[PDB]
Structures are given as structure tokens and as C-alpha cells.
Amino acid sequence: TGLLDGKRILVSGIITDSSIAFHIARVAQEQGAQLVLTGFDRLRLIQRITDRLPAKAPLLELDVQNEEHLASLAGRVTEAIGAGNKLDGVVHSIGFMPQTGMGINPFFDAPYADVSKGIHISAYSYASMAKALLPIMNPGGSIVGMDFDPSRAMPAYNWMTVAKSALESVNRFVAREAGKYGVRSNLVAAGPIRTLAMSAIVGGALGEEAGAQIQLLEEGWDQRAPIGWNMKDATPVAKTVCALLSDWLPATTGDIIYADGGAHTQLL
Amino acid sequence: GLLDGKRILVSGIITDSSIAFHIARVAQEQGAQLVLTGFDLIQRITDRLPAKAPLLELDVQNEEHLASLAGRVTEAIGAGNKLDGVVHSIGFMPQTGMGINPFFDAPYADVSKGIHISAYSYASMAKALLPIMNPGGSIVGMDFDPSRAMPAYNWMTVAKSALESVNRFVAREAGKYGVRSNLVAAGPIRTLAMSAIVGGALGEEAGAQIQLLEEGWDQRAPIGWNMKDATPVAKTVCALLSDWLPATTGDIIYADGGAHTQLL
Amino acid sequence: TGLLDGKRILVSGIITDSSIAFHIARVAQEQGAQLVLTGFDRLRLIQRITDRLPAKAPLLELDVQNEEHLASLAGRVTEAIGAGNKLDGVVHSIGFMPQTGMGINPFFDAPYADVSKGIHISAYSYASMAKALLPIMNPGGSIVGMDFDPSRAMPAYNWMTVAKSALESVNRFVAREAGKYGVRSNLVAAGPIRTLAMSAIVGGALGEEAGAQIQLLEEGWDQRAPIGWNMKDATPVAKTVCALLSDWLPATTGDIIYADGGAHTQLL
Amino acid sequence: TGLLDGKRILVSGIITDSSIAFHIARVAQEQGAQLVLTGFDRLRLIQRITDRLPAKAPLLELDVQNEEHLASLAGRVTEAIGAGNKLDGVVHSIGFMPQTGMGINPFFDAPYADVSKGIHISAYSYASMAKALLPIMNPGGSIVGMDFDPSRAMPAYNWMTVAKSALESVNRFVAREAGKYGVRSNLVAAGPIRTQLLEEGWDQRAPIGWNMKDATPVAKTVCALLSDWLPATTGDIIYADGGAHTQLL
Numbered sequence A, C: 001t002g003l004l005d006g007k008r009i010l011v012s013g014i015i016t017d018s019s020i021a022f023h024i025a026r027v028a029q030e031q032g033a034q035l036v037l038t039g040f041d042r043l044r045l046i047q048r049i050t051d052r053l054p055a056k057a058p059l060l061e062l063d064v065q066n067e068e069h070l071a072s073l074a075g076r077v078t079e080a081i082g083a084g085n086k087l088d089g090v091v092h093s094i095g096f097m098p099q100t101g102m103g104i105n106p107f108f109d110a111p112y113a114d115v116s117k118g119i120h121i122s123a124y125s126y127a128s129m130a131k132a133l134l135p136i137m138n139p140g141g142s143i144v145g146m147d148f149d150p151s152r153a154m155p156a157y158n159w160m161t162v163a164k165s166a167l168e169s170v171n172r173f174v175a176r177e178a179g180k181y182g183v184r185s186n187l188v189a190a191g192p193i194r195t196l197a198m199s200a201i202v203g204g205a206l207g208e209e210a211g212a213q214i215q216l217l218e219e220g221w222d223q224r225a226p227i228g229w230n231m232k233d234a235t236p237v238a239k240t241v242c243a244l245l246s247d248w249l250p251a252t253t254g255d256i257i258y259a260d261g262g263a264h265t266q267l268l
Numbered sequence B: 001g002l003l004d005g006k007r008i009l010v011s012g013i014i015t016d017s018s019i020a021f022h023i024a025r026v027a028q029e030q031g032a033q034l035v036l037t038g039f040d041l042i043q044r045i046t047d048r049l050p051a052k053a054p055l056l057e058l059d060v061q062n063e064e065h066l067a068s069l070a071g072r073v074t075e076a077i078g079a080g081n082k083l084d085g086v087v088h089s090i091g092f093m094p095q096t097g098m099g100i101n102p103f104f105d106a107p108y109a110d111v112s113k114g115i116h117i118s119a120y121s122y123a124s125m126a127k128a129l130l131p132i133m134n135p136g137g138s139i140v141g142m143d144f145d146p147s148r149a150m151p152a153y154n155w156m157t158v159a160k161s162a163l164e165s166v167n168r169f170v171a172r173e174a175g176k177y178g179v180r181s182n183l184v185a186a187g188p189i190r191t192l193a194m195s196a197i198v199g200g201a202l203g204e205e206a207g208a209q210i211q212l213l214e215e216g217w218d219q220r221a222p223i224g225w226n227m228k229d230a231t232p233v234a235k236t237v238c239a240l241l242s243d244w245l246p247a248t249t250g251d252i253i254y255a256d257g258g259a260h261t262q263l264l
Numbered sequence D: 001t002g003l004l005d006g007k008r009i010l011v012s013g014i015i016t017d018s019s020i021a022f023h024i025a026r027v028a029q030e031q032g033a034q035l036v037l038t039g040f041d042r043l044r045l046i047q048r049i050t051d052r053l054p055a056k057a058p059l060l061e062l063d064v065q066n067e068e069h070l071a072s073l074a075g076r077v078t079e080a081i082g083a084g085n086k087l088d089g090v091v092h093s094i095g096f097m098p099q100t101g102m103g104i105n106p107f108f109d110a111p112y113a114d115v116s117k118g119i120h121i122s123a124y125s126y127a128s129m130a131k132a133l134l135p136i137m138n139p140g141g142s143i144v145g146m147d148f149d150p151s152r153a154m155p156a157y158n159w160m161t162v163a164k165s166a167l168e169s170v171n172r173f174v175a176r177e178a179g180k181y182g183v184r185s186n187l188v189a190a191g192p193i194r195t196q197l198l199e200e201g202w203d204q205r206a207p208i209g210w211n212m213k214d215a216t217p218v219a220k221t222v223c224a225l226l227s228d229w230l231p232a233t234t235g236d237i238i239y240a241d242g243g244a245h246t247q248l249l
């Protein structure tokens, strides 16, 4: 008797067992969901990671910049879940911005080709995934994407923050389209999580200044959060995504739920 | 159920159309053990709920009621037991501050009474109940998006703006106990008073204003909005009372069909 | 040839020469405005302060909690500016919250009588002043109130922050009424300024913790502000109020202009 | 004795005499500003439009998608305003989104190449212009961009609304960089200007009304930000929309 019993859910964005999508997939399976997973480029490496999940799940290739992958996606998902079956949930947990657009590089020095690639993968692809999958979604369905509150500028995140601002706007338009199918579309704005890349930057991969900037940003988050914030723990974020995938927020769409310890509601 | 074994206090039941009646019904269906509070007929309404629940008197303007509340709740749930959830579903604004009366004609005594009951009491209830709440607990209040001005709601909208600010401060206090505090901003629901205003209780003008506001709500909402159905709102409150949004506090969840995210 | 040449403007809220209203009045006069001033309770003391302004201006008594003062206000202003003349501008620079609702006192320990008095003076009175003065305002006129960004909770400001959230809502309703007269209504959200009460709290009037909290808040403001923030300087705030009183923002109403060094737009 | 007396201001985005930039340029000149104008592609056609302004102003070519135009811009402006002189103001009044990403075309049918072009011109270029011009801006200077409130989704505007959400974020980062030079960066979010149901709703929501045929209130707001009268506002958005965004109905 789990929160997502009988639900068929697609989960994108697993690359390591530290990926937010790995924790979303794990919690959904613990809650009785039947998953279809999508991975990018390193499929053999992703399969070894997905073997660590509590249950077996088919793994499909999906490069969001690849038009052929998007055009064939619904058919490939239908084959994996069986003809006559449709999805109840879709999780977009995909984000990318080259090092020229986030980190140490000055905001003004990011070339447009890099920013454009980052926006394609991080924001436009939320619309691409909804376009491909809405024709195979059941009424009462739910599409969830991952966000990082971009309402105020911050050091280092730079063009990734710009990509999140675009993503929030894209989510509002996706909700208009999804509504026609009786499907909700929402974003979960998470606090900072120490995923593979974040641990490296903290360790000094981008130098002394970038490491210090991320450290000050994270410490401030746990300080502002009335219930605190654990950057090593994606479980509260995964649970929030599962709450939106469930039947328990049936009147919320085109919206943003903050799984950030309440940090964004406090100044100091 | 979603709330199996949880001990939850629910305030604000007056009729079986009250948002709190639907919150209480859904919470019991989901395995919660309730304590109810009423302001005084309520007993006859609460007898219509799926399960028996003790009913305590609570006038939020009454200092003695607030000072004795924790002790009275402890007696009802048994010594050694604490609350996991608290629902504030209390709102009031005299007709001089809400409806047909011009915005400038509301006397301060009426506005102040409305703010005391609709906003300040969220802090009063948290103060009284936090000492008897378990870690991982949840306090939820009812909101109506006041980010933009609208016809007729007038000083009630002002009271909701104050409530949203109060909720952010309540979260700071609640955090010390490992407790969350959040508001559910609902779309319009046809509760006893709303049905009367639509029927023409406040006249032709006020009835037409509320109707236009509602018609707009369903057209803006990408998934539509059913003003006669409180169940999506009750479910959202239960989602916040559950362990499934454990990192959300001082915040607002919109159970409005997504209307607030669309211009037209 | 000033920004406010020939404009008749009412300015409330002068108590000391550090009052934001004193600086608003000084800048307005430097810019060619003809003022009417209102003072609360200590009129003889206020007259000694207003004698320090560049030009003479009549001083009227106004306690916003006094119904008789509000009912007679328009007639008293008309007598001061001459029959057949009307106001072009109104400045609300009035705020109050008892120490039980702001400072060291726990948020939960503020009695409602104190909170209600603070809301009456800080938020409801913005509507009271508009009701009294709109019948004696010219088209193209402007009503301006003072705000402190209450979108996020902060230590020590407690119930004063709640009062500002109410004020922002009141301003949006005042704009609906003012629009009928061709008059704009807006708030200026200022950064922290060391005025009478704020200087005392910093000095330790509410104890060590309240003083330390305000100090940390002010320091954070200057670091977040891309152009910095000088808490001892009310001139940038006074200039912003004068910009709203001018004919240069003719399509802005029910709104909030931030004179805070841009601090509210930055996380760190 | 105008609002912008002695100020040297660059104004981009004039294409017709109904362009918001034309009205910004006209009001700035009426207020004593000395202008430098930039135009895209149809320079001969733009020059004839700029001749309609009250005063003469040099016209420079600027395609924001052209890296060479951006790299040479500061030097070309300095030559026009004379050596030893710097700008006090910069106006970005540039926007574009292909018809596949706007109007009638379904939101899902806009190819990424079109959306990317729209974002490059409408959002990224605000950063490009600031990068090129900040080294030739005076302290107390002001950069202003044109915005359309994208906080809520609306019919037809689709990917242009997405581009404005990106622009708002870009403006907040530009303010961080501009602050180092003592320069402010802000956007003016305007109501609809005729350069129908959505536009009709605006006038009824606006407490002071909204005239879609009149760009002068928008031009005046931009001039207010270019002046010394909002010296503590940066990374922000000023709404010149009749107050429509503050009202539900």
C-alpha cells in the first residue's frame, strides 16, 4: 500500500547513484511505482547504477538534443510498458551548463553556443519531453521537473540560473498543454545537493574561489532554513517529487514546490 | 492511509460545507485520530464525520481559551501523547470590510477584529500547540492568494497578506520543535456564505462580481476549477500534514487549478 | 527649474532631522515643491526640526488614530494652500510597532492590542490618508508610502514585517480608488536607515541579541547590494520618493519601487 | 534645463517611428540628452526614421548576433562622442522571436534553432551590450532594457514570454557586473504597445487605464531610470503598465 501503487512512471536523469533522479526512482519503487528509465550517452555505465535500485526497470536511450530520440520515445515507452498501457507520471531531472557559463568563468565570457546548449538541455527539453509523452499519458497524470530558485542572482551559478528562469516560464506553458490531457505539470525547486560535480567543486576542482563561493552559499542555506538543510541528503527532495506524482496535490499545476528547508522564505 | 496513527487538531468546522469539515473527513479516511475545535450546533455537524472525535471550545479572541488549550488537548489524547498536526481553517471579516461596502468605509475596529481572527490567530494557535507537538509535525493554515487586489474581497485580502507574513515567522518558531508551518492557497469554494452572495444576499453588483471572479478562475486554470468541490483542497492540506513534503516550510502551496500561474 | 516646480505636496512623518520624511521634504523643496507638513503629538518640538528645512512650510497636527484629525484634514490643508488650490502629492512616512512586537521580545509574546495599534498606524492609515486627501488632489497626482520589503521573514523586525505585508496589500486597493481621480499610489521599499528607533535598537535599547541581529542584517544589505548600501544616508531614498511625486513615472500605480541598492535582487 | 541635460546616451532598437526606442530617443532629446543610435540590418531605412527625431544623432550598425560588431562597438561609440568622453546611459530596446515561437503556432511546434535565435537577440544580447559598453560608461551611469511581464503564462506570446523570463534573470547578473563601475541596470516592463482580448483586459485591470497606441508613458519611465532620480535601484524591474499587473480583475 504505497503512495504510487500501480502508477507507471518514466524517470530521466540518472547518471550516478548520487543523481537526484536515482533517489526519485528509488523512493517511487519503494512506493509501488512501475518505472521506465531514460539515460544519456553512457548507457552501459547507467545500467550498472540502475542495477542498484530496489527493482528492475527497462532503460531507454534519450538524448534530449536528438530529434530522432524524441520522435521515437513514445513508441519505445509503449513497447516497454505494453500496448494499451499509458504513463501516469514523467520526471525530468536533466540539467547541463558548460563550465564557460557556470563556475569560475566571468558571466560576460560565456559564448552564446555554450549558453544555447545549456538552455536547450536544461529548459527547452522540458517542453520536448512533454510534447513526446503527453499523447501516452493518462488523465490525472503528472509531469515533474527539477528547479533551483532563480528569482535572485547568485555567485558562480550564472547562466545555469538564467536557464532555470527560462525553465520556470516553460513549465507554465507546458501546464497549458498538459491540462488538455488532464495532466498536471510542476517543478520542484530543491536546495543545494552534493551530487558528483558539486562534491568536486567543493574539493577544489575549479580552484580556491569557486570552492569558497559554493561553501558560503550552502552554509547560508542551512542557516536560513527554519528546519535546516542537509546538502548530502536527496531523500526530502525525492519524497517531494513523489508527492507531486501522487493523487495528493490534484489541483496544483504550472507551479513550483520548494523542497529547500524553507530557506527561500527567510532573509537571514 | 496517508496519515495512519497521526494525531491531528482541526479547527474551523461550522457547517458540513466548511473547508475544515472536508479536511477532517479526508484525514479520518486516511487513518488520522482527530481533536476538533469549534467557536460558539457544531457537535451535530461533527457527528456526520466518519469517526468520533473530541470537540473542544476555542474562540481565538479568548486569551483564557488559548492558555488552557494545550492542557485540554493533552486530556483528550491522553497523558504521554502529543499532536503530529494542526489545521487552522479560521477566517472572518465583517461586511463593512468585505463585500459591497467601499474599501475606504471599513472602520478600524472591524478591520482589526478581522485581522485578529484571520491572521494573528495563526501565531496564537502555534504558540499554544507547539509545546505539545512531535518532531516531524505540521501546522497548516488556509489562504486566498492576495498578491493582487480584486473587487469585493477588500480587507479580507489585506488580512490574507498579513497571514502569509505571519506564516513565515511561525515557521521560524516551529523549526525549533522540528515542525513545519505552511499555507494552502485555495481557489474559490462555495461555502454557506459564498452561495448566499452568489444568490444575491449582498445585491446585484456583489453577486455579479463574485460570479465574474469564479468564471475567470475556471477559464484560467489549465486543469479547470470546480468551486462546488472542496476535496482537492482537503487532499492538499493532507499532503502537507503527511511525511511527503518534509523540506517545505514557511511556504504556500496553491490548490487553485493552477489559475494563479496564468494571465488569460 | 526643479523636478517638482509648482507642485503642492503634503509630507507626513517628520520627528527628527534623521527622519526619512525630513530628507523627502528637503529634496522636494530643493526641487521647487511647495510643502504642507503634518506632525504627530510633539508639535512644538517638530516645528524646531522643520525650521531647519530650506523653506518655510505650514505644520498641521495629524494623529492617524484620531478620527476628528482625519475628518478635518482636507479643510485644514485647503486653508493652508488657499481655496481653489489642490495637492499634487501626498507622502505617508508613518510607521510604528510597540517593542513587544519588534526587537528582543519573542514573536509569540506580542499581545494583539500592540499588534493592532502597529497595524492601524503602519498600514490602515495609508487608506485613511488617501480617503481624506483624494477629494483635494489634482489629476496626475501622486500618493507615496514608505515600505520595508516583507516578502521574506527576518530576525527582530517580527510584527513590523507583518504590518508592511498588510501595507503592500492596502497600497494595491488605494490605487483602485486613486485611479478614479487620475492619481497614482505607490510604495518606496527602502533599505535600512539609522532613524530614531533603529539607532536606539543598534545602540542596545532592546538588549545585546536584538542589536547584533540588526547589525548582521545591515552588513548583509551592503554586501548583497551591487551598488552598495549606506545605512546613514537617506538621500537616495528621498530622491526615489521625489521621482514618484514627479511626472516621470506616469504609468506606475499600486506598485513598489525598491530604493535598496538592489539588495533584494541578490541572494549573496 | 531638462531631466537628462548633458547626458550622453546610446539608444538601440529603432526600426519604425512607432518603435518604443523612437519615443525613448525623442523624449531623451527633448530632455537635453546627446544621443548615439544603433540599428540592425536596414540602416538606410533606419537613417530616414532617425531624421524624424528633434535633433541630429550619429547612427551605428549593431547586429547583436555579430561578434565583430560587439567587439568594435565601444571604439565606434567613443569616435562618435569624441575621445575622452564616456556614456551616461544605455538603452536596450531589442526583441525578436520567429513566428514559429509566437502567435498562432502551437507552443510545442517551435524548433529549438528558432527559440535559440529568439533568446540570443532578446535576452543574451542584454549581457553582450553591457559587456561591450560598461568599459566606456561613467560612474552614476544607467543601463535600461525593455521587458513584458512574464511571471504568468499567456496565449500567443509563448516563447517570447520564455525569452523575457530569461531577460529578467540576465538583468540581475548584469547589475552585479555594472555595480563594479558604479552603474545601475534595470528593466522597464511595459504594457502592450501597437508597434486583442489580452490587450483589452489590460486597460480594464489598470487603475489609471492603459492606452496601447501611446508609447510616451513608457518612454518617460525609461528616461526616469536614465536620470539621477532613482540612484538606489538596480537589478530591478519598473512596471510602466498602468498598474495592470497589481490587479486580478
Ligand SMILES: NC(=O)c1ccc[n+]([C@@H]2O[C@H](COP(=O)([O-])OP(=O)(O)OC[C@H]3O[C@@H](n4cnc5c(N)ncnc54)[C@H](O)[C@@H]3O)[C@@H](O)[C@H]2O)c1
Pocket (backbone or CB within 6 Å): A012, A013, A014, A015, A016, A018, A019, A020, A021, A039, A040, A062, A063, A064, A065, A092, A093, A094, A095, A096, A121, A146, A147, A148, A189, A190, A191, A192, A193, A194, A195, A197, A198
Ligand atoms: N544538485 C543540486 O544542487 C541541484 C539543485 C536544484 C536542482 N537541481 C537539478 O536537478 C536535476 C538533476 O541534476 P543532479 O544534481 O542530479 O545532477 P546529475 O549530473 O546527476 O543529473 C543531470 C542529468 O542530466 C543528464 N543530461 C545531460 N545532458 C543530457 C542530454 N543531452 N539528454 C538527456 N539527459 C541529459 C545527465 O546525463 C544527468 O543524468 C537538474 O535539472 C539540476 O539542475 C540540482
Ligand SMILES: NC(=O)c1ccc[n+]([C@@H]2O[C@H](COP(=O)([O-])OP(=O)(O)OC[C@H]3O[C@@H](n4cnc5c(N)ncnc54)[C@H](O)[C@@H]3O)[C@@H](O)[C@H]2O)c1
Pocket (backbone or CB within 6 Å): B011, B012, B013, B014, B015, B017, B018, B019, B020, B038, B039, B058, B059, B060, B061, B088, B089, B090, B091, B092, B117, B142, B143, B144, B185, B186, B187, B188, B189, B190, B191, B193, B194
Ligand atoms: N472560497 C473560500 O471559501 C475560501 C477560499 C480560500 C481560502 N479560504 C479560507 O478557508 C478558511 C475556512 O473558510 P471556509 O470557506 O471553510 O468558511 P467557514 O465559514 O466554513 O469557516 C470559517 C471558520 O472560522 C471560524 N471562526 C470565526 N471566528 C472565530 C473565532 N473567533 N475563533 C475561532 N474560530 C472562529 C468559524 O467558526 C468557522 O468555522 C478561512 O481561513 C477562509 O478565509 C476560503
Ligand SMILES: NC(=O)c1ccc[n+]([C@@H]2O[C@H](COP(=O)([O-])OP(=O)(O)OC[C@H]3O[C@@H](n4cnc5c(N)ncnc54)[C@H](O)[C@@H]3O)[C@@H](O)[C@H]2O)c1
Pocket (backbone or CB within 6 Å): C012, C013, C014, C015, C016, C018, C019, C020, C021, C039, C040, C062, C063, C064, C065, C092, C093, C094, C095, C096, C121, C146, C147, C148, C189, C190, C191, C192, C193, C194, C195, C196, C197, C198
Ligand atoms: N528606517 C528604516 O530602516 C526604514 C526602512 C524602510 C522603511 N521605513 C519606513 O519609513 C517610514 C518613516 O520612518 P523613519 O525610519 O523615518 O522613522 P521615524 O521615527 O523618523 O518616522 C516615523 C514617523 O511616524 C510618525 N507616527 C507614528 N505614529 C503616528 C500617528 N499615530 N500619527 C501620525 N504619525 C505617526 C512618528 O511621529 C514619526 O514622525 C516608516 O513607514 C518606516 O516604517 C523605514
Ligand SMILES: NC(=O)c1ccc[n+]([C@@H]2O[C@H](COP(=O)([O-])OP(=O)(O)OC[C@H]3O[C@@H](n4cnc5c(N)ncnc54)[C@H](O)[C@@H]3O)[C@@H](O)[C@H]2O)c1
Pocket (backbone or CB within 6 Å): D012, D013, D014, D015, D016, D018, D019, D020, D021, D039, D040, D062, D063, D064, D065, D092, D093, D094, D095, D096, D121, D146, D147, D148, D189, D190, D191, D192, D193, D194, D195
Ligand atoms: N510592443 C510591445 O507591446 C512591447 C511590450 C513590452 C516590451 N516590449 C519590448 O520592447 C522592445 C522593443 O520592441 P518594439 O515593440 O519597439 O518593436 P520593434 O519591432 O519596433 O523593435 C525591436 C527592435 O529589435 C531590433 N533587433 C532585432 N534583431 C536584432 C539584432 N539581431 N540586432 C540588433 N537589434 C535587433 C529590430 O531591428 C528593432 O529595432 C523589445 O525588447 C520588446 O520585446 C514591447
Ligand SMILES: CNC(=O)[C@@H]1C[C@H](NC(=O)[C@@H](NC(=O)c2ccc(Cn3cccn3)cc2)[C@@H](C)OC(C)(C)C)CN1C(=O)c1ccccc1
Pocket (backbone or CB within 6 Å): C015, C095, C096, C097, C098, C099, C102, C103, C121, C148, C160, C195, C196, C197, C198, C200, C201, C205, C206
Ligand atoms: C518619534 N517617536 C517617538 O519618540 C516614540 C518612539 C516609539 N517607538 C517604538 O515604540 C518602537 N519603534 C517603532 O515603532 C519603529 C518605527 C519605525 C521604525 C523604522 N523601520 C525600520 C524598518 C521598518 N520600519 C522602526 C521602529 C520600538 C520598537 O522602538 C524603541 C525600542 C526604540 C522604543 C514610538 N514613539 C512615540 O512617541 C509613539 C507613541 C504612540 C504612537 C506612536 C508613536
Ligand SMILES: CNC(=O)[C@@H]1C[C@H](NC(=O)[C@@H](NC(=O)c2ccc(Cn3cccn3)cc2)[C@@H](C)OC(C)(C)C)CN1C(=O)c1ccccc1
Pocket (backbone or CB within 6 Å): D015, D095, D096, D097, D098, D099, D102, D103, D148, D160, D195
Ligand atoms: C526589424 N524588424 C523587421 O522589419 C522584421 C519583423 C520581424 N518580426 C518577426 O519575425 C516576429 N516578430 C517579433 O519577433 C516581435 C518582436 C518584438 C515584439 C514586441 N513585443 C510584444 C510583446 C513583447 N514584445 C513583438 C514581436 C513575428 C512574431 O511577427 C510577424 C508575424 C509580424 C512577422 C523581424 N524582422 C526582421 O527583419 C528580423 C530578421 C532577423 C532577425 C531579427 C529581425
Ligand SMILES: [Mg+2]
Pocket (backbone or CB within 6 Å): A221, A222, A223, A224, A225, A226, A227, A228, A229
Ligand atoms: Mg537554520
Ligand SMILES: [Mg+2]
Pocket (backbone or CB within 6 Å): B218, B219, B220, B221, B222, B223, B224
Ligand atoms: Mg481552464
Ligand SMILES: [Mg+2]
Pocket (backbone or CB within 6 Å): B136, B137, B242, B243, B244, B246
Ligand atoms: Mg513527518
